[PDB]
Each structure stands twice: as C-alpha cells, then as structure tokens.
Write a protein that binds this ligand. Structure first.
Ligand code: HEM
Ligand code: HEM
Ligand SMILES: N=C(NCCC[C@H](N)C(=O)N[C@@H](CCN)C(N)=O)N[N+](=O)[O-]
Ligand SMILES: N=C(NCCC[C@H](N)C(=O)N[C@@H](CCN)C(N)=O)N[N+](=O)[O-]
Ligand SMILES: C[C@H](O)[C@H](O)[C@H]1CNc2nc(N)[nH]c(=O)c2N1
Ligand SMILES: C[C@H](O)[C@H](O)[C@H]1CNc2nc(N)[nH]c(=O)c2N1
Ligand SMILES: C[As](C)(=O)[O-]
Ligand SMILES: C[As](C)(=O)[O-]
Ligand SMILES: [Zn+2]
Lengths: 403, 404
C-alpha cells in the first residue's frame, strides 16, 4: 500500500501516504513500468471531481464544513444538474492554479508554488483579446529581467463548442526553416509550427533565432497571426566568462519560458488555454536546447573552438564542451540581470520542497527522470532520492495539437 | 494500433513496440495508481512450472522445441522434482541460463556483450577453501592482465534444509571502510559494515584509504572462513590526469575488476545463492559514483580546490568541472595501464545497438532508465532520449538478504 521512500545519500526514510489520494491512473502496471515514456499512450463524474475540489478549497482556507462550504457545494450541484457544467469563483481558480503547479510531478521549481500571479482571462472572446492578455502576461512576467511566476487562464472548454487555443508550444520560440538539403536553419523542434505560421500568412525571416509569431485560436475559428512587440521579448546574448571567442558564435536565448499548449484541469473543468511561466533552470538552455543532437546541436562547434580532441569519445570533449556552454548561459543571464537558477541551486530547493511537502501532505509526486538534470545527475541531491510518481488533481495535462 | 507498449526515441523519431514484455511472469513494484520505478529495492507445483518454462526456453534457443529430446527432458525434470523436491540443470543448460540472466538484467548497460560470457561451473565445490580456489581462478582469468573477460562462477544451488553457499562480500574486490574515533570514515564508507564483520571474524585490519578487503566465504551450515586475496591477483590502477600533473599526487587508485558477489542467480526455479560475475567498468562507476558521491570518497571538493575553482558558489559549476576531470582521469589511467574500460559515450552507444539487436531478436529489451542513463552528461548520451520498458524476465539476477 504505502511505499517506503528512501534517500541513499543520507539514509533517511519516509512513507508516501499522499499517493492514496490519486484518482487518476498512470501508465504503469505490475507487469511493466512505463515511467520513462514522455507522453501518455457525465454529471456523476464531473460532480464528484467538482465536490472534491471544493472540499480541497475550503480545507485550504480552513473553513471546511462551514456554512460557506455547504452553500458553495449546493451551488455547484445546482449548476451541474441544471446545465451539465459549472464555473469557478476567481479565488477558487487561483487556488486550483497553484495546486496544479504543486502537483506537477515533472516540475523541479515547485518550492515556488505558493507565489503565483494568476490572471483571470475567462472573459475573453477573440484572438485579438487573447493577444492583449498574452502581451500583458509577458510584460508582467518578464518584469525587466526580474522574472515573476505567472499564469493567464482563458475560457474553459464547453460541450459542443470548439476550444480556445494557443498554437505555439511556448509563448516565445525560435523558428525552424527546413532548407534545400533537409537541414534546418534555427530551432529544429519548431519546424512544424514555423511552417503553420507561414501557411497562415507570416513573412518568414532567415536567421537562426527568429522569434515566431503567435497563432491564437478562438472557438471554431481558423487561427489568427499576431506578432509580438520586439520590446516585449527580452533576450540574452550568450558570452563566456573567460573564453572571449564564445560570443563570436552569436548564440542568444530568450529569457521567458512559458508553456502554452498544456491543459489545466480543476474540479473537472478543463482550461485548454492557460499559458504559465516561471523562470529557466540553466540546463534547459545550456544542455537540452543548445546541445541536443536534434536541437541546435552546437556541441561540436564549441568543442573545435576549445580545440578539443573530437576524434575520440574517451577524451570527453562533449562533457567538457557542455559544461562551458552551461557556464556561458549562467554567466550571460547573470550579466543581463535576468532570473535564472543553476541545477544545483534548483535541486537543492526541490529537496526542501520534498521535506516541506512530506510534513504538509505526507508525500510529494515526482518524476525522477525529469527531476534529475541532463548533466551531472549524481552530483545533485535528487539523483540519490527515491521518488513516487502518481497523478493528483488539480493538474496540468498534455492535450492534442489543434491541427 | 498494436496492443503492446509503444516505445519512442525522441532524438531519431523512431518507434518500436515491446512484445517481449508479454513473457514476464513476475510482477514489478508499480501499479496504475503510482510508479515506483525509481526505487532501488522495491511449492513443488510452483517450482515445476518455473522449470518447465526454463526447459522450453532452452530448447527454443537450440531450435528443437517440441522435439523428443525436449519432451524427454521435461519428463526427466518432473520425475526428479517428483521424487526429490528439486532437480538439476545440465551443463549446457546452466551456460544458457547464466547468459540469459545477464541478458535479462534491466539495469545493465553492458548487455551488448551478453553473448560472450565465460561460464565456470563449480557445482561440485564442497568447502569454503575450495570456494576460495574457484574465486581466485575466476579473478585470474577475468583480469587476464588488463584485457578483461566477462565471466561467472556458479556454486552449488540452494538445497532443501541444507545451508546456502554464500559469499559475504558485496563484490570479490572492495576497499575497507574504517570508522574513525572522530566519527568520519577512512576508506570507502559504503563498506563499513563488511569491514566490521571481517574484523569480528579475525581479520587484522589495516588503516589505509585503499585496503583490499579479505573474503568471508561460507559453505553450507558452517560459519564463514576468512580468506585474504593474494596481492598479485588484485590488479589496481593508480590514477593520474592527462594534463593536470598534480592529480597523480592525490594518491587515488581503483581496482580493475568489478565482481558482484551477493546476487542470487535464479534459473528455472533453482536458486544459486553464490554466483559471482564480472565484466569490466564503465568509467563513470569509478570517476563519478565511487569517487564523487557524497557518501563515498567524496573527493569533489578536494579536486575542485586543486583546480582552483570557486567552490563558494554553485553557479560556478565547480562540481561539474571537477567531476569531468576526475572521470577523464579514470579513463586516462586505465588506458595508460592497458586495463579494459569503456566510457559512458561508447558504452551507451553500444547499448543502443543492443536495443536494436534485441528488438529483432525478442521483440524488446527490458531496461531501467534511471540505471542506464549515466551519472554525468546524461542527455549527451543517446540512451537519455530513448524511452524504455522495464519488467522482470527469467532467468534473472536478484538481490538477496545478507547472510548475517
Ligand atoms: C519558478 C520557476 C520554475 C522553474 C525554475 C521550473 C523548472 C522546471 C523545469 C526544469 C521543468 C522541466 C522542463 C523541461 O525539461 O521541459 C519544469 C516542468 C514543468 N513545470 Fe516548472 N518551473 C518553474 C515554474 C513553473 C510554473 C510557474 C509552473 C506553472 C504554474 C510550472 C509548471 C510545470 C509543469 C506543468 C511542468 C511539466 C511540463 C511537461 O510535462 O512537459 N513550472 N519546470
Ligand atoms: C562486459 C562489461 C559490462 C559492463 C560495462 C557493465 C556495466 C554495468 C553498469 C554500468 C552497471 C550499473 C552499476 C551500478 O550502478 O551499480 C551494471 C549493472 C549490472 N550488470 Fe553489467 N556490465 C558488464 C558485465 C556484466 C556481466 C558479466 C553481468 C552478469 C553476468 C552483469 C550483470 C549486471 C547486473 C545484474 C546489473 C545490476 C545489478 C544491480 O542491480 O545492482 N554485467 N553493469
Ligand atoms: N522552466 C520552465 N520550463 C518549461 C520548459 C518547456 C520546454 N522547453 C518544452 O518545450 N516543453 C514542451 C514539452 C516537451 N516534452 C512543450 N510542448 O511545451 N517553465 N517555467 O514555467 O518556468
Ligand atoms: N561493471 C560492473 N559493475 C558492478 C557494479 C557494482 C556496484 N559497485 C555495487 O556495489 N553494487 C551493489 C548493488 C547495489 N544495488 C552490490 N551489492 O554489489 N559490473 N560488471 O560485471 O562489469
Ligand atoms: C525518454 C526520456 O523519458 C526523455 O528523454 C525524458 C528524460 N528526462 C527529461 N527531463 C526533463 N527535465 N525534460 C525532458 O524533456 C526529459 N526527457
Ligand atoms: C534513488 C535512485 O533510484 C538511485 O540514486 C539510483 C539512480 N540510478 C542509478 N544508476 C546506476 N547505474 N546506479 C545506481 O546506483 C543508481 N542509483
Ligand atoms: C571561436 As571558434 C574557435
Ligand atoms: C593541486 As592539489 C592542491
Ligand atoms: Zn513505473
């Protein structure tokens, strides 16, 4: 029943009893674990999810069982029985948003979960309106390099009607232009979305870091193209602290990470468009985006620049190159006074979070493969920490691409 | 589409379906409610079906499934288990089972070599002293003066009532761990307990940072006897860095032969409580875990100081910089001393090749992602981008309780 969770660096042991609160199934079975896979292969229902969430809400404000709680439960009941759905009060939406983040098994920056600026954009009715909301989110979230965690929530999904959607995976991304020989100019992960924009009328550029335009879609309407104001998108030029030649690579990366393709679920209500943003962990840029073989794959260039023996693996030219690249990122952002957290500082904070959560809820869902950084795994405390992964709600989930 | 786990490699975009998982006959630690994938430690009738299953596996491997020899061996096993409670494997069956266990090991990234394993049968062994002889022969052959050769020595199987054959040490070669007066540990903290058992058993302990421990071998129903390994047999590699001339002055060293010895080899229901196996190292086992783990030698800070790095702030990546040089030092000294070793880049690339081989051969390959991805430079190796299905196949290697 209750799993024994152990830390092999300290020898400490805990028991996760929070997992018993999981109402949704994961991909694993007793016959085989599929935990390393990235994606997941009625009034009665909604009403129970709803009641559960309203319960979670009143416990949070410690007025559980009070009159306000009973009344709110009747309100939800009344509305669903009559209309087959219901709506969240703004304070409830704020609570749910923070809970969804807190329960995100794959997020290592959850120690911040309680500090989330929630923008209610549920009174939105057009791509143009979505665009203004998104532009405000960015201005606020970016805050002159002193990033602030924020989420903007658009109109919930409705039976029969189409979903409100942001077609980009993130609010800010660089284009990927397929060229003559199947090669790619820019970010290879964004080839498809870069072409969808062009197909909808965007005048493509020809650089390695062309910030893409947003394709916003209001219910049952073809998406609309919007270009983000260059001054709204803060970027950081990457230069190395000692290798004067690094800058010559002209590498640069935007300061704001803001997933916009995930779905936010609360009390059974589904918000198909709810972009969120906190701040980068340096490895996301230095390791994954700049070094993945299917991304900017610059590992070799930096290696040759450092004059390394890229002739053999055992020379570890790749490992050496990666480290400087990550150092270059940390340095640059620090130099541009833009918020960023290295993977050591980040994982250290997660461990406290795991402790805070152990005492607060008796456990914490975590996905090991995602919590452990892409470089220097065992050198971080999370590597040595066993973790239990299960699905809690409020939750952020993946959803199909709208095309 | 196919009703089997879909597996994707996000670097190449390719897909496969694992159908091999259908063959697993033992539940794992997970359930639809929660994944415990990251946890390290998560009846004549029953023995009969396990054995029949194995025999079938054997005859399939030699392409004689359904034949008379097959149907006769099955008859033979039932007869034997029927009038004794257990049964015995044939030479060729043990060799096939030992290799399959290696082959089925979810946590081993070196499985591409599973085919080339030297199986030393030692089921005749009847004393602790003879256990020592067998082990010394293993080390001698496996070490092969630096050109390591995969091998496993199988001792007598667990018998009804009779005591198990057990090697008390975790590996045939391990360094001592001495608890100090002030609380710290001299040597390898991981082996503090076994070092204490070697002493409670008459061993005259040394006081170095790298003292090779003696072996505590145990024959059925007898207390363990203490055997000291002849130094000439235990090959060690002094570590030095290729350009940091001062690294050699740290006096760090590591043995060449990794030989797990506390694992139980299970074949067709038979349990081999003592069956030490050895291959060769992946540089990160030494350079990253053993030398840099906080609870091991913990030399990260020392090395960082020597490189004159700013250990006051995390964002300097002093830990990352040192770990890299240490790992390179392990690779450089092994290459220098002509001792077999493989870095995490070559190792993982060869494992990708293995996955591709097993896809065609068995329709899948059970793998533990957390154990396959190396402790450093994770996403720089191809396995990180490879999804993996994990399940228990038999024969297999299993953890077993400490004999004491
Ligand atoms: C305060 C700064 C934060 C940091 C440093 C942080 C860091 C991370 C990192 C490293 C990842 C993995 C990214 C990847 O490898 O693709 C992640 C995933 C995630 N984070 Fe956070 N996070 C932070 C804030 C937030 C906020 C504000 C939210 C939303 C309210 C959030 C929601 C999530 C979710 C949903 C995932 C998993 C997404 C997926 O499955 O792909 N994070 N976070
Ligand atoms: C040929 C060279 C080999 C290499 C490079 C190799 C490499 C590895 C590595 C890196 C690990 C993980 C070590 C750890 O983190 O504790 C491992 C685990 C394992 N290997 Fe291999 N291996 C090789 C040969 C063998 C052989 C000969 C066998 C058995 C016949 C074997 C059986 C296993 C098993 C069962 C595990 C997991 C044990 C556990 O759960 O602690 N390996 N191997
Ligand atoms: N630090 C954050 N990182 C989010 C990183 C998102 C990642 N770069 C990405 O592209 N994720 C894919 C999912 C990749 N499996 C997506 N569709 O958004 N988030 N934040 O709020 O501060
Ligand atoms: N390279 C190998 N490494 C074996 C790794 C052994 C590891 N150092 C260790 O101490 N393992 C624990 C098991 C930890 N789960 C043990 N009890 O032997 N194996 N080989 O045959 O080539
Ligand atoms: C196949 C494997 O699950 C996949 O590559 C995972 C591993 N760990 C990860 N960890 C983080 N933070 N982000 C990722 O995208 C991944 N990808
Ligand atoms: C808690 C976590 O399971 C533990 O630290 C695991 C992770 N991956 C590992 N991988 C290998 N090869 N060896 C190990 O000892 C571990 N330890
Ligand atoms: C900067 As190039 C060598
Ligand atoms: C270099 As040493 C102290
Ligand atoms: Zn699992």
């Amino acid at each position: 029943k209750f799993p024994r969770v152990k830390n092999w660096e300290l020898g400490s042991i805990t028991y996760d009893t929070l997992c018993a609160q999981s109402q949704q199934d994961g991909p694993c079975t007793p016959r085989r674990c599929l935990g390393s896979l990235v994606l997941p292969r009625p009034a009665e229902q909604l009403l129970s999810q709803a009641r559960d969430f309203i319960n979670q809400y009143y416990s949070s404000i410690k007025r559980s069982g009070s009159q306000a709680h009973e009344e709110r439960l009747q309100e939800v009941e009344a509305e669903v029985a009559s209309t087959g759905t219901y709506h969240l009060r703004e304070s409830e939406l704020v609570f749910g948003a923070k809970q969804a983040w807190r329960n995100a098994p794959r997020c290592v920056g959850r120690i911040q979960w309680g500090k989330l600026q929630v923008f209610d954009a549920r009174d939105c009715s057009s791509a143009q309106e979505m665009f203004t909301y998104i532009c405000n989110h960015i201005k606020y979230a970016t805050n002159r390099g002193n990033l602030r965690s924020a989420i903007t929530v658009f109109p919930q999904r409705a039976p029969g009607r189409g979903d409100f959607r942001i077609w980009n995976s993130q609010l800010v991304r660089y284009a990927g232009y397929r060229q003559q020989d199947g090669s790619v100019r820019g970010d290879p992960a964004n080839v498809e979305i870069t072409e969808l924009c062009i197909q909808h009328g965007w005048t493509p550029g020809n650089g390695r870091f062309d910030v893409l335009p947003l394709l916003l879609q209001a219910p049952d309407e073809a998406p609309e193209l919007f270009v983000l104001p260059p001054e709204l998108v803060l970027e950081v030029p990457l230069e190395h602290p000692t290798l004067e030649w690094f800058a010559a690579l002209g590498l640069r990366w935007y300061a704001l990470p803001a997933v916009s393709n995930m779905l936010l679920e609360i009390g059974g209500l589904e918000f198909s468009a709810a972009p969120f943003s906190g701040w980068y962990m340096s490895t996301e840029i230095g390791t994954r985006n700049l070094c993945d073989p299917h991304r900017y794959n610059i590992l070799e260039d930096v290696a040759v620049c450092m004059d390394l023996d890229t002739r053999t693996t055992s020379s570890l030219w790749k490992d050496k190159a990666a480290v400087e690249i990550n150092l270059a990122v940390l340095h640059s952002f620090q130099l541009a006074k833009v918020t960023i957290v290295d993977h050591h500082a980040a994982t250290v904070s997660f461990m406290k979070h795991l402790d805070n959560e152990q005492k607060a809820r008796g456990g914490c869902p975590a996905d090991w493969a995602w919590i452990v950084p892409p470089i220097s795994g065992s050198l971080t405390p999370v590597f040595h920490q066993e973790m239990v992964n299960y699905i809690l709600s409020p939750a952020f989930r993946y959803q199909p691409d709208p095309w």
